[PDB]
A and B are shown apart, each in its own frame.
With several copies, the nearest count.
Chain A
Amino acid sequence: GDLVGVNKDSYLILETLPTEYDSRVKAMEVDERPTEQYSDIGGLDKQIQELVEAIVLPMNHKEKFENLGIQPP
């Protein structure tokens, strides 16, 4: 399943090429960091919390779920 670089004539492999990603997936990646801050979102402070703590807490406190021991949502 790997993909390597081969000589033309000898058909003898030479290198080992790293990855296999479609170019449209490279356009899916952000590199711009669209700056918005939680004060700009009024009237959703219930939904703001339970969105953040269900996502950010398994990314900065991994042991905190594992201290009790559950799978994160």
Chain B
Amino acid sequence: CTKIINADSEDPKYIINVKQFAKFVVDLSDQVAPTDIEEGMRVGVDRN
């Protein structure tokens, strides 16, 4: 589980943040809408 910095326009391309490690550029899964992934919200993220 992580914490999201911000989204960006035209594309999903979310900026994510974890506890001590880096910040990544991520994407969703099929099982969730892009609606309730608003910014500054803790989310769970696979390890690969």
- Chain A interface residues toward B at CB < 8 A: 5, 15, 17-18, 21, 23, 26-27
Known A5-B25, A17-B15: A26·B40 in contact at CB below 8 Å = yes
**Residues in B neighbouring A15, C-beta threshold 8 A:** 25
Q: What string of 1s and 0s marks CB contacts (under 8 Å) between B1-38 and chain A?
A: 00001101000000100000000010000000000000
Q: Contact: A23 with B15, CB < 8 Å? A: no
Chain B interface mostly helix, strand, loop or mixed? strand
Q: What is the total number of residues of chain B having a CB less than 8 Å from a CB of chain A?
A: 7
In the A-B complex, the 9 residue pairs with the smallest Cβ-Cβ separation, listed nearest first, are A23-B40, A5-B25, A23-B5, A26-B40, A26-B39, A17-B15, A18-B8, A23-B39, A15-B25
Could you name 12 residue pairs across A and B whose Cβ atoms are closer than 8 Å?
Answer: A5-B25, A15-B25, A17-B15, A17-B25, A18-B8, A21-B6, A23-B5, A23-B39, A23-B40, A26-B39, A26-B40, A27-B40
| Nearest B residue (CB) for A18 | B8
**Residues in B neighbouring A17, C-beta threshold 8 A:** 15, 25
